[PDB]
């Protein structure tokens, strides 16, 4: 009932209208990062979106249904971040992901820096599939920000 | 009370600018969902 695409997550609880994050509507389910909503209900126009699944450690949450995004970075190709910065038009940024190496294995990472409210912007492969969400990351030695490509389980 | 506003289609852009490095980093993820550099 609500169109596929990328969406800003706004709140009026602070000064003015504030963008706290971004998310993806696909197959009837809204996908964003846990730290954006803390699992709170969302409104979409007149209707209400209720949380359905979430996990603080993965830093993901889905609304109206189970996590639907299952594409993954192929470990070789460039991707595009569809950055949706607060107050600014959506812009695609192409990049070759780096790698977060962890005890439990490797995931892609994108070394692109944006305001906090950009959290949740989707990362896409050349087919337009969302391979994860932007905004859970680290700051490295030279002071630059690097975000995991954070993907859920379908 | 939070609300959502449509911002675009989800599509690859052929003319897109290309930027960003490809660092290979050892990280740890803790129970609180925070990454840190090992
Ligand atoms: N050069 C930057 N610091 N660039 C970041 C880019 C943010 C992109 C969206 N992500 C986020 O908001 C998450 C939320 C929390 C999700 C946690 N699970 N965030 C982050 O991942 C980072 C990294 C956390 C590492 C945790 N081990 N968290 C921040 O920076 C903090 C500051 C901070 C830096 C290093 C270590 C710890 C905390 C908030 N940022 C600021 O205070 C100043 N920067 C801005 O105000 C705009 N840019 C920025 O905020």
Angstrom distances, CA of residue A34 to CA of A23, B9, B17: 11, 22, 29
**Domain match, A92 and A52 both:** no
**Domain match, A7 and A56 both:** yes
The tokens of A3 are what? 């169109």
**Domain match, A17 and A63 both:** yes
Q: Is A37 helix (H, G, I), strand (E, B) or coil?
A: helix
Pairing mode, strands A29-32 and A42-44: unpaired
- End-to-end alpha-carbon separation of chain B, Å? 37
Look at B3 and A90 and tell me if their CB atoms are within 8 Å: no
Q: Is B3 helix (H, G, I), strand (E, B) or coil?
A: strand
- Number of domains into which chain B is organized: 1
**Minimal CA–CA distance to A11: which of A1, A24, A22?**
A22
- Characterize B7-37 residue by residue with b for buried, 16 or more Cβ atoms within 10 angstroms of its Cβ, and e for exposed: beebebeeebeeebbebebebebeeebebee
**Domain match, A111 and A65 both:** no
- Whether A119 is catalytic is yes
**Minimal CA–CA distance to B20: which of A151, A122, A97, A120?**
A97
The tokens of A69 are what? 């995004």
The tokens of A77 are what? 């190709």
- Number of domains into which chain A is organized: 2
The alpha carbon of residue B4 is apart from the nearest alpha carbon of chain A, in Å, by: 5
Pairing mode, strands B17-18 and A91-95: parallel
B14 part of contact set with chain A, CB < 8 Å: no
Q: Which of A59, A62, A121, A147 is catalytic?
A: A59
**Domain match, A92 and A54 both:** no
Q: What is the resolution of this structure in A?
A: 1.9
Q: Which residues contact B35 (CB under 8 A, 6 or more apart)?
A: A100, A136, A137, A138, A148, B27, B28, B29
Domain span at residue B22 reads: 1-38
Q: Is A117 helix (H, G, I), strand (E, B) or coil?
A: helix
**Minimal CA–CA distance to A27: which of A54, A1, A53, A50?**
A1
Last residue of a domain, one of A69, A95, A123: A69
**Domain match, A41 and A78 both:** no
d(CA B24, CA A127): 25
Q: Is A109 helix (H, G, I), strand (E, B) or coil?
A: strand
Q: Are A2 and A25 in contact (CB under 8 A)?
A: yes
Length of chain A in terms of residues written: 154
Domain span at residue A23 reads: 1-69
Residues forming beta bridges with residue A148, ordered by sequence position: A109
Q: Are A19 and A87 in contact (CB under 8 A)?
A: yes
DSSP state of A118: G
**Domain match, A65 and A76 both:** no
Q: Are A116 and A24 in contact (CB under 8 A)?
A: no
**Domain match, A30 and A46 both:** yes
Technique behind the model? X-ray
**Domain match, A154 and A81 both:** yes
**Residue A75, number of CB atoms within 10 A of its CB:** 9
**Residue A15, number of CB atoms within 10 A of its CB:** 6
Q: Which residues contact A89 (CB under 8 A, 6 or more apart)?
A: none
* Cα A66 off chain centre by: 16
Last residue of a domain, one of A69, A104, A126: A69
Please list every residue in chain A whose beta carbon sits closer than 8 Å to the beta carbon of residue B12: 80, 92, 124-128
What DSSP assignment string belongs to A50-107?
-EEEEETTTTEEEESSS--------SSS-EEEEE--TTS--EEEEE--EEEEETTEEE
**Domain match, A58 and A91 both:** no
**Domain match, A88 and A55 both:** no
Cα-based torsion angle of the residue sequence A153, A4, A129, B26 in order, rounded to the nearest 10 degrees:
-50
């Amino acid at each position: 009932e609500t169109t596929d695409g990328v969406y800003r997550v706004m709140t009026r609880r602070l000064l003015g209208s504030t963008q706290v994050g971004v998310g993806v509507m696909q197959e009837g389910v809204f996908h964003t990062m846990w730290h954006v909503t803390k699992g709170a209900a969302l409104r979409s126009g007149e209707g209400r979106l209720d949380p359905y699944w979430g996990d603080v450690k993965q830093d993901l949450v889905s609304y109206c249904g189970p996590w639907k995004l299952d594409a993954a970075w192929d470990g070789l190709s460039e991707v595009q971040l569809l950055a949706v910065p607060p107050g600014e038009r959506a812009k695609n940024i192409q990049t070759l992901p780096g790698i977060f190496k962890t005890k439990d294995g490797d995931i892609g990472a994108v070394a692109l820096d944006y305001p906090a409210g950009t959290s949740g912007s989707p990362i896409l492969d050349k087919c337009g599939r969302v391979i994860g969400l932007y905004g859970n990351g680290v700051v490295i030695k030279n002071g630059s920000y690097v975000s995991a490509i954070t993907q859920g389980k379908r | 009370d939070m609300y959502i506003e449509r911002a675009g289609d989800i599509t690859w852009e052929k003319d897109a600018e290309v930027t960003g490095n490809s660092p290979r980093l050892d990280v740890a993820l803790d129970e609180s969902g925070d990454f840190s550099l090992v």
